[PDB]
Amino acid sequence: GDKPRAHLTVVRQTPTQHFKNQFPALHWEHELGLAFTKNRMNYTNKFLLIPESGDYFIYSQVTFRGMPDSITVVITKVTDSYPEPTQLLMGTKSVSGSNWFQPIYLGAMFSLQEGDKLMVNVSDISLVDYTKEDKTFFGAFLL
Amino acid sequence: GDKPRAHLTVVRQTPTQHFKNQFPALHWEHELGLAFTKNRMNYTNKFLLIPESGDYFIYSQVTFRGMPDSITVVITKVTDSYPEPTQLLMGTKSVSGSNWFQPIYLGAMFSLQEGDKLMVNVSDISLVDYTKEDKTFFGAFLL
Amino acid sequence: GDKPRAHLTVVRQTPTQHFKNQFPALHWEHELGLAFTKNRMNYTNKFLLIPESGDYFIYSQVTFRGMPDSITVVITKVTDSYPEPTQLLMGTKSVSGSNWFQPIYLGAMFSLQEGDKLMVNVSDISLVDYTKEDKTFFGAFLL
Amino acid sequence: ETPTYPWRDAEERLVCAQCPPGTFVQRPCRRDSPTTCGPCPPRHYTQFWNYLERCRYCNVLCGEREEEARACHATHNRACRCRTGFFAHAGFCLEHASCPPGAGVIAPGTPSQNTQCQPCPPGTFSASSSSSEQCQPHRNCTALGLALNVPGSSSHDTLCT
Amino acid sequence: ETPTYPWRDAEERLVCAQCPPGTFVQRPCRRDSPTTCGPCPPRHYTQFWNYLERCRYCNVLCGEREEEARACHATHNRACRCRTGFFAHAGFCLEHASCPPGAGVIAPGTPSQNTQCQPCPPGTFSASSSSSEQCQPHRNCTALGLALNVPGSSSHDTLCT
Amino acid sequence: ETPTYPWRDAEERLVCAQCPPGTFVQRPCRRDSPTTCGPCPPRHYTQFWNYLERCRYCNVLCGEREEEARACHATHNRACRCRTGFFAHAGFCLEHASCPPGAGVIAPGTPSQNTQCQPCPPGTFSASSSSSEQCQPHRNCTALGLALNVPGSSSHDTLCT
């Protein structure tokens, strides 16, 4: 009938204040241009919020641009029932050419629960091409 | 019930006569081998034609082979209601090794309207590996 | 209603005893961690087994790590009605930097028949990063 | 004369007027009424006559070494160009090149192309390796009242006595 | 003796005959009737006995530096090989290598392997750096009626007087 | 004091106790009964208080040049570290670096960092290019009863007579 869906697009990222050595999460646009959310799928501050238990297809592309040794995208599942997140998908690539750019695309199916939160983490947030909605994006839909 | 679907595969491309500096669109096979269209999804001359308004998952891979500075795949939406197309998805990669090949894969979900047309554009049409249906392809399905 | 689905994750591969020059098939986890199969989709010894005729979305990522000239992932369809398999999807990349790693992602839609078997083949099985479920995986779902 | 479009009325097949740049179809035409064209909301634009039911989003962000060439306006998208000492090509935005001693600047660096160097034709020279210096002519010891003890084509002009 | 397959009749479980190379199952078998095997349409093939309900598509296109080894036939796919002065490996189709002065051709370039060079054993030489020249023997000034003023193993044969 | 969680009873809204490390919620709480915490199955773990309805899977495999730092336990995941002469960084696990003649080891190679070399301060030397040799002091011909015929700072200590 009316299934939860969202396609999110990149915006300008704010520099991260401190390093936990942790991979910082991307912020997203959720309603303008090609970005949308519908049918109870909520986007709040870096998280896609799962409204309904079921199997979802989740995808993301992050275009990296450099003007380190590797670039990495991870898609992460946060739940209240446990302090540590789960790494659902990882796209990791070694970087060898002083001016370069490269996309990383990830997509797969996962069983998710109502209340679960999804985020996209990257190795270095300053390498992320944020200049257009078609190059860096993040989405999910109930099957 | 019966949802619009198509999976298109690469054929031999005809050389583009003139350069608008524009990214030329690929031509596709639509019925032979692994290629098919069904449920009112029409393929005509480079375009997948959207028969029904709704949310679609769209994907493409283009394998590039070189025997420039970058290779680029864009998935583009054309509508009659506006002269300029919309860039839905862009996979762009810098090329640094005189003999090389590389795939670019893109997939995401978009709200589309009946009458919309989808095409795949590439930076350099002569770099496209066209030798087999499993390396370069283009598809879409209503969710 | 209840549609066939599976998401499979990488395990430690056993070395292949002999070389047919053929691309060896990966083995997968099918029930632990993020791996699951449901609704009559069976995984047996390298094969996802198709229980129902219809259109499927199939995807795979294989992360390659090197500490050859190319790395290759193929998704292959085996049927009893014919001795030779069908290559549905191929992701192939030339390798140029003595320590490197690289993912290859493939996803597309195919018309499949009850009884069909799906496998993932790679060029060199010893290059496959098997260390975590989020880096190398294989899935399929009826649309 | 006014651009037009066909529409499926929730009643018939009628011929509605399109909307001008800076507007979109807020409401389709009716037999009674002409198209209601509403203004594009902030951060949105339509650059042409159209029958869009939603304006286009100003989706270009200027990044790295770039600044606004055009601002987001109701009739055009935002646009970005490479900065002063920078030019764009092949998808990247890299700093202008400098002409070495021997070649001169025949084309100054533009946000589009790179500084084009050309070796100076016999009778001229280029001292420095900057992207400003063009092909300057040699000293005339003849029409100055001296003698050409030493002359160098590549650089250094000439020394008279 | 004839290859066979099991089938779910729209009636029962019966045992139908398979179809020979160049054909496919146009209609399944029935208790009354044997399998109807129809011929593969143009640009299609079946290379083996089968019970496919559709022939396979000749899906190989020859590209770059390649030509047809086999044409698309009702009983086999199209096939491609690398051209005359070219060989294929690792997924690419690259031109044969030339043996430099000092090594000779023991294995001429085949559409499969590369031209294998081997340094010429004492008593032979290789003058040119082409992929045709093998290890040619030195001149015998002894059995010719001269004297060996100069001899070079690497190249240049020998000079007699 | 005991960590707690809210739950939708199949009856009401009640407040159930969480489960300790090494357990998971086998059955939710009921007004009558406290949470049933069951033990994590083999190859599974929970490291914290939780209300998971399934334990987490020990999903880390040690590979390449790695061995188990921690084993899979009911209260923790498996963990891997780089081997003896190896260290990990940026996602790879590569062998320790050796200090060349002139610099010495101030920090031995740890499974985490690389062997840090520092050039020896005037009065010391480093003979070999291994990752074991530190900055050793020069010979004193003064307090030994000889004379310093030759001294080298970079390596070779000194030669007395």
Curated annotation (Swiss-Prot), chains A, B, C:
Site annotation Important for binding TNFRSF6B: residues: S81, E84
Locations listed in the record: Secreted
Carbohydrate attachment residues: N42, N121
Ranges per topology, Extracellular: 1-143
Origin: domain of life: Eukaryota
THD domain: residues covered: 4-143
Protein's name in the database: Tumor necrosis factor ligand superfamily member 15, secreted form
Gene that encodes the chain: TNFSF15
Curated annotation (Swiss-Prot), chains D, E, F:
GO biological process terms held by the UniProt record: apoptotic process; negative regulation of apoptotic process
Cellular component GO terms, alphabetical: extracellular region; extracellular space
TNFR-Cys repeats mapped onto the chain: 1-37, 39-80, 82-117, 119-160
Molecular function in Gene Ontology: signaling receptor activity
Glycosylation-annotated residues: N140
Key words, A-Z: Apoptosis, Disulfide bond, Glycoprotein, Receptor, Repeat, Secreted, Signal
Disulfide bonds: C16-C29, C19-C37, C40-C55, C58-C72, C62-C80, C82-C93, C99-C117, C120-C135, C141-C160
Main location: secreted
Domain of life: Eukaryota
Tissue: Detected in fetal lung, brain and liver. Detected in adult stomach, spinal cord, lymph node, trachea, spleen, colon and lung. Highly expressed in several primary tumors from colon, stomach, rectum, esophagus and in SW480 colon carcinoma cells.
UniProt-annotated location(s): Secreted
Function as written in the Swiss-Prot or TrEMBL entry: Decoy receptor that can neutralize the cytotoxic ligands TNFS14/LIGHT, TNFSF15 and TNFSF6/FASL. Protects against apoptosis.
Protein name per Swiss-Prot or TrEMBL: Tumor necrosis factor receptor superfamily member 6B
Annotated source species: Homo sapiens (Human)
Taxonomic lineage of the native organism: Eukaryota, Metazoa, Chordata, Craniata, Vertebrata
Entire-sequence positions represented here: 32 to 194 of 300
